[PDB]
Amino acid sequence: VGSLNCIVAVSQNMGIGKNGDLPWPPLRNEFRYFKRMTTTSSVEGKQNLVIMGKKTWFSIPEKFRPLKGRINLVLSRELKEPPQGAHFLSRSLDDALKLTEQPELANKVDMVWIVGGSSVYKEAMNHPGHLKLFVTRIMQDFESDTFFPEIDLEKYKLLPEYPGVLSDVQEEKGIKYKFEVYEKND
Ligand SMILES: NC(=O)C1=CN([C@@H]2O[C@H](COP(=O)(O)OP(=O)(O)OC[C@H]3O[C@@H](n4cnc5c(N)ncnc54)[C@H](OP(=O)(O)O)[C@@H]3O)[C@@H](O)[C@H]2O)C=CC1
Numbered sequence: 001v002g003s004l005n006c007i008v009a010v011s012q013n014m015g016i017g018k019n020g021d022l023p024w025p026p027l028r029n030e031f032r033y034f035k036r037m038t039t040t041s042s043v044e045g046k047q048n049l050v051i052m053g054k055k056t057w058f059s060i061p062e063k064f065r066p067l068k069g070r071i072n073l074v075l076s077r078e079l080k081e082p083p084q085g086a087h088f089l090s091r092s093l094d095d096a097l098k099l100t101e102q103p104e105l106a107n108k109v110d111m112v113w114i115v116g117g118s119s120v121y122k123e124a125m126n127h128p129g130h131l132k133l134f135v136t137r138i139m140q141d142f143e144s145d146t147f148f149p150e151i152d153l154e155k156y157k158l159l160p161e162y163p164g165v166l167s168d169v170q171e172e173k174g175i176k177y178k179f180e181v182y183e184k185n186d
């Protein structure tokens, strides 16, 4: 299995959600960025795995579930089986990551992408080892009811360049945003 990664889009007040959806109106090229980063694998014959909480699963419009070309794993302790359209169910982040080492997945999975929500971001960010965060900074405040956990910059270095990630300011629907990549190893 390849690298472990989080990906998120976050407002200036660290909002990631409101009422089961995003705080901001749809940013189509920001969604396309999410799709390109989470789907693209450099390793032939492999796919990437997405790990998400249950509310995050049900926040994706049904027509886009499962996230296509990716293996979709949902975290829940109440569900008894994967939701309709999902591929896997785990009861903890540690279980999910261990599952990637089972024979069922060991040679199928390239990258692992944690796509939220707040509790799994927080646990992953504090998971010892090598991790990258792909953070879209939405450069306005948006009313939110779900927030990104604190990024500890003593351990997460903001990278000064990354192949394939645009460095300049983006703007859609009058909303400016920029892409960042962080990396820790501890
Ligand atoms: N801007 C962005 O990049 C993102 C935005 N969002 C937004 O955030 C909101 C959803 O996030 P959030 O509210 O944090 O919810 P989550 O997606 O984290 O879902 C929470 C539920 O998932 C299960 N769960 C979460 N973590 C674990 C775990 N480690 N092990 C087992 N079960 C787990 C639980 O289900 P159970 O009770 O069944 O055990 C829990 O009640 C939505 O508004 C969505 O649109 C989400 C991701 C990214």
Ligand SMILES: CCc1sc2nc(N)[nH]c(=O)c2c1Sc1ccc(C(=O)N[C@@H](CCC(=O)O)C(=O)O)cc1
Residues within 6 Å of the ligand: 007, 008, 009, 022, 028, 030, 031, 032, 033, 034, 035, 052, 056, 059, 060, 061, 064, 067, 068, 115, 116, 136
């Ligand atoms: C899954 C939770 C995440 S992680 C993330 N990261 C960044 N940078 N931006 C985001 O908005 C999200 C979100 S919220 C989100 C992301 C993607 C989608 C979605 O439907 N994605 C489709 C593409 C949707 C489209 O093409 O309009 C896909 O990846 O196949 C829905 C909600």
